[PDB]
Amino acid sequence: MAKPSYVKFEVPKELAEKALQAVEIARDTGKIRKGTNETTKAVERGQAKLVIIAEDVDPEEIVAHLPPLCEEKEIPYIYVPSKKELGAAAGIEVAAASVAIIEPGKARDLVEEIAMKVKELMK
RNA sequence: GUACUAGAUUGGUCGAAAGGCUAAUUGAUGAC
Ligand SMILES: [Cl-]
């Protein structure tokens, strides 16, 4: 297939599943921010530990600023295929084009793993 | 304009009301 230009690397299915799992566990035991306004602010404030970006966002410009900003702030980001499922994982009733984990809670080791894998995918 | 926010509308139903329940539509692409 072909990906939107804001998608900078290919994410294996098991790694996207881990991202959604991390969002759900952080929702349950830590702190997240959901929606692109809240997500971008958390990145600008240095609060985000991981940013999760859906791959089916149209128009792209809603999230296109996130990867360059995350790279500047040196905050890891990861992609999932469905904004609908990302909103569900974030505990809301509609889609979420992006989410930020602020406090991973019990997702701490999962976020570290994703971060380590993304660093290799970034090369 | 900035920050915050996860509700909102209509119909049905229950209720003495406040409103609860419920369905459809709608809201993190940020509704009210
Ligand atoms: Cl009503």
Residue numbers in the entry: 1 to 123
Show sentences the authors wrote.
Box C/D ribonucleoprotein complexes are RNA-guided methyltransferases that methylate the ribose 2’-OH of RNA. Archaeal guide RNAs have a second box C’/D’ motif pair that is also essential for function. In eukaryotes, however, the predicted box C’/D’ motifs diverge from the consensus sequence and often lack one of the two sheared G•A base-pairs.
The guanosine of this base-pair engaged the backbone HN and the side chain of L7Ae residue E38 in two crucial hydrogen bonds with its O6 and imino hydrogen, respectively. There were numerous polar interactions between the box D’ sequence and the Arg and Lys residues of L7Ae helix α2; thus, despite remaining single-stranded, the backbone of the box D’ element was oriented similarly to that of a canonical k-turn, while the backbone of the box C’ element followed a different trajectory. We conclude that L7Ae induces a kinked-structure in the RNA even in the absence of the 2n−2b G•A base-pair and when stem II is disrupted.
